Amino acid sequence: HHHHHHGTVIGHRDGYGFLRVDLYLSSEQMKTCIHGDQVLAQPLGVREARIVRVLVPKTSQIVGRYFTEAGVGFVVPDDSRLSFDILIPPDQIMGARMGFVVVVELTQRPTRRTKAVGKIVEVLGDNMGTGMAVDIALRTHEIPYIWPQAVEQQVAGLKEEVPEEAKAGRVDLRDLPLVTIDGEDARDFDDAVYCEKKRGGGWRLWVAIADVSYYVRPSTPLDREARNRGTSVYFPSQVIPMLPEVLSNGLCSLNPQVDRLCMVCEMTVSSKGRLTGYKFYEAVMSSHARLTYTKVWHILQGDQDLREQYAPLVKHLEELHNLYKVLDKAREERGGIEEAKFIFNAERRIERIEQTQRNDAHKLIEECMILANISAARFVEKAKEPALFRIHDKPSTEAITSFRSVLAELGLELPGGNKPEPRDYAELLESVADRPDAEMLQTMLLRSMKQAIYDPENRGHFGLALQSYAHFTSPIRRYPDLTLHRAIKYLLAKEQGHQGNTTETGGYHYSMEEMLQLGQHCSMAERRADEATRDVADWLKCDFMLDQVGNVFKGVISSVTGFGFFVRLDDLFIDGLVHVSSLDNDYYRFDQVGQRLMGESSGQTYRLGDRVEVRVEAVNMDERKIDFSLI
Ligand SMILES: [Mg+2]
Secondary structure, eight states: OTTOEEEEEEEOTTSOEEEEOOEEEOTTGGGTOOTTOEEEEEEOOOOBEEEEEEEEOOOSOEEEEEEEETTEEEEEESSTTSOSOEEEOGGGOTTOOTTOEEEEEEEEOOOSSSOEEEEEEEEEESOOSHHHHHHHHHHHTTOOOSOOHHHHHHHHTOOSSOOHHHHTTSEEOTTSOOBEEEOTTOOOOOEEEEEEEOTTSSEEEEEEEEOHHHHSOTTSHHHHHHHHHOBOEEETTEEEOSSOHHIIIIISSOOBTSEEEEEEEEEEEOTTSOEEEEEEEEEEEEBSOEEEHHHHHHHHHTOHHHHHHTHHHHHHHHHHHHHHHHHHHHHHHHTOOOOEEEEEOTTSSEEEEEEOOOOHHHHHHHHHHHHHHHHHHHHHHHTTOOOOEEEBOOOOHHHHHHHHHHHHHTTOOOOSTTSOOHHHHHHHHHHTTTSTTHHHHHHHHHHHSOOOEEESSOOOBTTTTBSSOOOOSOTTTBHHHHHHHHHHHHHHHHHTTOOSSBOTTSOBOOOHHHHHHHHHHHHHHHHHHHHHHHHHHHHHHHHHTGGGTTOEEEEEEEEEETTEEEEEETTTOOEEEEEGGGSOSSOEEEETTTTEEEETTTOOEEETTOEEEEEEEEEETTTTEEEEEEO
16 A cells, blocks of 8 residues: 555546546546546656556446437536546447437446447436436436335334334433424424523523434344435435435424434533533433424514414423523634525426525524534543544645735734634634625635544544534434434443343444444545535526526626636526636736736736626536626
8 A cells, every 4th residue: 555545536527637535637547547436546746646456447327418420329428527428339229319318337448549338228318407407416426316125125014103112111201392493394303402491500401313223223224225325315395315204204203293212312501501411311202393493483583473373382492592592602602613595486496596594593403403412422432432423624734824825915814823723713703704805704714624524533523613523413314323323322221231232222333443434435425415416506506597698797706716717696606607718808817825816917806705797608508507707
């Protein structure tokens, strides 16, 4: 291995590529490499890399469109990072027609002297819409969506009601006024909340979680497919769930006024919002109400109709609000640190675009879940039990250096010395809030942050300013949370003197070697789901702008490159490119650290965060890209 690197090939539509381990792959090297290959590589000069061998080749389902040249069929990949055509012999056409979207299995990889060859294994057709975009995204990103037969068989024997035999031995919380608060369109209720004032100060908080590990035991078909998926995937009006709906919307979901098994984190909180204690136990509950964020917020604002309808719960909802206010302040004391809302028509296409409104009902659930997440992480960390922590690393030295150089030119500084802490960034964010360039500085700060991941090494969570954090409260839709419930049940039994590695209600002890693999896989699945949903969102946004060619929009420069700058349209969350060739004729200089394109003769300056107006010049539906002209 010295000195090799295992990495994944990332193609580029222009013929060259990259190795994700940042290494560059020449155009000639990419004649035998395929976007998605897993390889062993060696570094060269400047940083270029040479491929030693292909460890896991990319052969799986390639989505593209079918055409013919001189009677020879071929497929143009939909993902232009697969920057080659695929010949299809005439007996492997499966009855595809010109322009149809098809799915290909490679039979010959491309080489320097020959083109790739494949066979069409599925024909999707020419009816391009939201359903088609989802179908393409599932296949391109290899998201599992077909239920294995063994999963269907495992689930066939499930009763609709929890049997009394399952409730025996559990803490009875059915008289506790636990409630669920979720979006109107949600059907998989992972969590329920209740809190009381604590005698002498503070609060006692119950966070009750769907007891997924009771229903999904290790190595069963349900477990193997849940790990395979890694997470639920959320498309427009359509969920690809990690678990079959009979569990995720039924027995696991904490539905109203029905007895349900749950795993409970019961916590004490000080009058200043500090977690002072926690315990975990299996219980049975009965949700007193299925509420929405909108209803709860209106209740807290004083809405008469809702406070009459839910009068027996109003005091309990107000107490969660009181607790939240102090938890929010505790997050501030700790070190602290806008989204599109698609309105769809009946055909799952965008009718209009709104800005999501986030209110105290969203945030009180968020802070309650964070407390349970902290409690679960501290529980497994103190026990030295192999588990996935939800970690968020410090910003890179290079990102801090570039950020401080941008700040210094403005007379600003990032406090905290050479290794600033979350509170230092939060202090800087406060200081710049009212500046005209606050959005530019916030964007630069957030873009210096690393991406959060699942990892069995607890390196802390920078963004939340937490020493120990782990995802515990959504085991219906995240595989890491499922494994954490298993570890907690295993530890609870061990504290009672139990000596086995499993528990009759679903506990399980994992090895550190398993957890290393699981962290990489589950972090992969999280990113994979995000890229697929973004693909579909890109298609919907381009479809929405198709009839806007020629029209003018206000926007903000969202990224600057040597070939132009991208602009995000105000209130629409839609991006497009102002190419440098569309600007006034000049010699344009690119400042990378300043994120600036400067015209030498004109003195004109287009910088990240600048407010502009752009005209929609073109919408390319095949590439899902929009072209702008400035002014
Ligand atoms: Mg929920």
